[PDB]
Amino acid sequence: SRVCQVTGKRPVTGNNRSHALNATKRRFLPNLHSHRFWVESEKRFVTLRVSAKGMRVIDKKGIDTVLAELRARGEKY
Amino acid sequence: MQVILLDKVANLGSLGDQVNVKAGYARNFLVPQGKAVPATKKNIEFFEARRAELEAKLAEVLAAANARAEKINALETVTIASKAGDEGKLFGSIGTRDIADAVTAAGVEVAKSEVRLPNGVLRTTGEHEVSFQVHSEVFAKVIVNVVAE
RNA sequence: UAAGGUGAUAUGAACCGUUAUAACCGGCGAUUUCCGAAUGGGGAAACCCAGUGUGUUUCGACACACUAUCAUUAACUGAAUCCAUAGGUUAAUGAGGCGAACCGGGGGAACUGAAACAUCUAAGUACCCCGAGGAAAAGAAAUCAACCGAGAUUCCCCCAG
């Protein structure tokens, strides 16, 4: 599913509004990308489906700290 | 992204320095190779430990280089046995162990290696310059007056 | 507890019992076919077909037990690839499905009303889905107030159509 393993960003629903304010149901999808992340703690590439923000979160927290939060959430990576 | 370097990098820096790198370069290249590691509030002391475990164990030695090289002006009067003939010039030679065991009398540590003798072997009964290898850069001083014997 | 009893249509038959194992009532127990989450594999539900391990046999064949999946943990093992890791086998623990309403969450109509209609309305209603519990959610101020002070959340009546 279109969910980020770091953040848990999933598609959220909303409305498209026109100039006449005609509302129509629509989805907001995250900016999900599969990216291989270097885990130097383990000498291994780990592949995560992640949002661009989760990519920012990994840079900040470090993939080592992040993955410890994932295996503390199930979330087999 | 601010990161430090574990090696020299072409158009960036040298052997450890905080510089600002695009996230993709650091993330997709610099960190997967061993060319860098970010500042994470730890590597400003942890890989900055090769510059702080360094200084935690390099700091106090900068002073030893002096006290290991100061008390050699105390005597300035040493004379060592060796053969010596006419004209004031010598018969034999002067190695380094000649002066290494000579001034063990003077107490504080002295060696044959951490003394250095010139390429000439002091074949004179006359002042010919010598120095001590106390510190590698700072030169310490040697002059012995070989006993004209 | 008892002189009456063997459920009903429902009579009859053959019997039990009457001073305490008749029946009846209650508690703990026992048995509890097959299907069905159905779980050994399959399948047109109540059927078909096994495997392993024991113990039995007159050597024709019998009886019982275990054998799903997933998750977790563990042990053993184990690639490409030296390490390792994936992967494999087993054990143990737990889950699975059903169920009225209430609850929380994820999605989300239109008729209709506007005396047409699109904003708006209907309505976060109906409906679908996930999950839980005896209730759930919420909850101990980064709240209100107005220079006086109140002192978490929830529900009721007012404030007020």
Added chain:
RNA sequence: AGGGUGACAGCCCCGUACACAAAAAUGCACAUGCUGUGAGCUCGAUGAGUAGGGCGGGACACGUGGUAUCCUGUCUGAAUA
């Protein structure tokens, strides 16, 4: 109270008020015991891709309106008593 009994029963019957009762199992309360969880003091510490912002949406009675406040899909991004 009621329900029955050959028509309408306080006294025919079953019952009702009232009084009593459990081998066995069990509930909710109490007391008490084994096992595990930690108070009390003292000094420290005070939740960052977060708050906030831009874009698009939603929620707040409040339809973006002069619109605070909450949530966030996207891009960003502090101070830290």
Added chain:
RNA sequence: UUUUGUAUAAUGGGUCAGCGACUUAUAUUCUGUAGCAAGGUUAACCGAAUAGGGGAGCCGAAGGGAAACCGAGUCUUAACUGGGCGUUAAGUUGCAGGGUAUAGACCCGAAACCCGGUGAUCUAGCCAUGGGCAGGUUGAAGGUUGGGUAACACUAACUGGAGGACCGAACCGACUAAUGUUGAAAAAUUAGCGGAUGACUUGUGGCUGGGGGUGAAAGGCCAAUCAAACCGGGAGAUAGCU
């Protein structure tokens, strides 16, 4: 009943019996009636439970002004001879009732819109696997021979057995006519008619699902239902109409 007007040949009713339509809740106003009265009354809740307590509140006793503000006056205007609204009138809470409002709102009744399901045992198309086509005809290519060219070209005979080929049964279909039209039958029967080795037909099973399918295309067919199926739900949709 509906109408200007109905014996009307305008509507409805075969008959009887039974059922079948102005309700309920909350707000609001007017009337009546009762209580108290410049005061009336409590709500939730407490409970000494239809008591009593609870006066938080609501209405009323003052209005004018957009408002600050003023106040039996106020606003207006620089100010009124003035003018507008007001002062000179008891209300309030119950009970009953008449209206209004929100709710299905007097009852019955649409076509339809939307949500979620059920359906390809009919039919349409496709997929796989099996089957069926009596009998009779025509006689393509090719082949062979004779004939003919320097050799190819070539022409009778035999052979051969092609074809969305011919006639015609089973089988598949349905052009005409009659019958029947509360039928034997919610599409048939009778006589004739078309195809009948193919783009054929048929059995078994399978796939496609509703704004979707499938369609040699008729808006045809998708279980006697199709310009959006069926069932259930929204739902007592709405109905200025009958």
Added chain:
RNA sequence: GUUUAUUAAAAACACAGCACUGUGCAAACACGAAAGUGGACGUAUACGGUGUGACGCCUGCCCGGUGCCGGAAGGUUAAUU
């Protein structure tokens, strides 16, 4: 040959043939929020779409409009800043 099962079998549909156009393969295109699947275990003598509709003689003038293709100095022009 096909068709309005149940009032229309036809001049309608289809048809071989013709042309135009798209498509270089992870093809276009289509079903699918997606994965994927068909196309096709095919590869431009192929595939999809459109129109015409055996065969024969042929298919004339018009690119102003609308689309399609291409071109690009200038003008107009969104988010953003």
Added chain:
RNA sequence: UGAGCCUUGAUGUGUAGGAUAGGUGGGAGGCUUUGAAGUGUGGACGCCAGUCUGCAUGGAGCCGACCUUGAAAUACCACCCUUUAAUGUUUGAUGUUCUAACGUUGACCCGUAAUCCGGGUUGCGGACAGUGUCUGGUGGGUAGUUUGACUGGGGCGGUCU
């Protein structure tokens, strides 16, 4: 190939003049042997007067109160304003090249006696492509709807204050 900017090297012709006076202070001479001053001349700038610069050999000298002059010497120091050359350097466009993201419905290896999947090795592309958010355009492909009344029936026409 566009621009800011630590910081320095160039930019300062009312004219008096020895001839190219932003300015206050710090001060009386700064540089010249990690080379003075004299020559050719480098590509700059210029009021047509020379300012400063690259280099050759060079080897003991150009530079004030100078008298004048509203101003006293680029003699040194120093913050600083008109001007204008460069790069460590910030982000802009284009072009080329790369690889490490990303892709691969290429080959090969293992998982695995598996045309899925994953991992691995390799090649090919490669910051493209592709996807998210935002945005302009297109958009009966699909949806929701509108498309008036009077009227000697309706429609056409005419009319609507």
Added chain:
RNA sequence: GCUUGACUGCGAGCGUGACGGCGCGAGCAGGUGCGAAAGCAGGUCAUAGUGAUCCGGUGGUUCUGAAUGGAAGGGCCAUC
């Protein structure tokens, strides 16, 4: 010829309209013009020459100003 009464605030009372509204209006206050003065003048001989509300805009006005001082916005007056 002179001028700005095509004035500002009000308005007894009438008229005409279902209403919204439209119209006529002496006289009062203030200020003006014409005229020696009486007086006339609140547009044009009259009756057509127009468009509700909403949403906004502009100017004025310290009416209001969500702790408070301001401001925003709102109100009120004039006009689009």
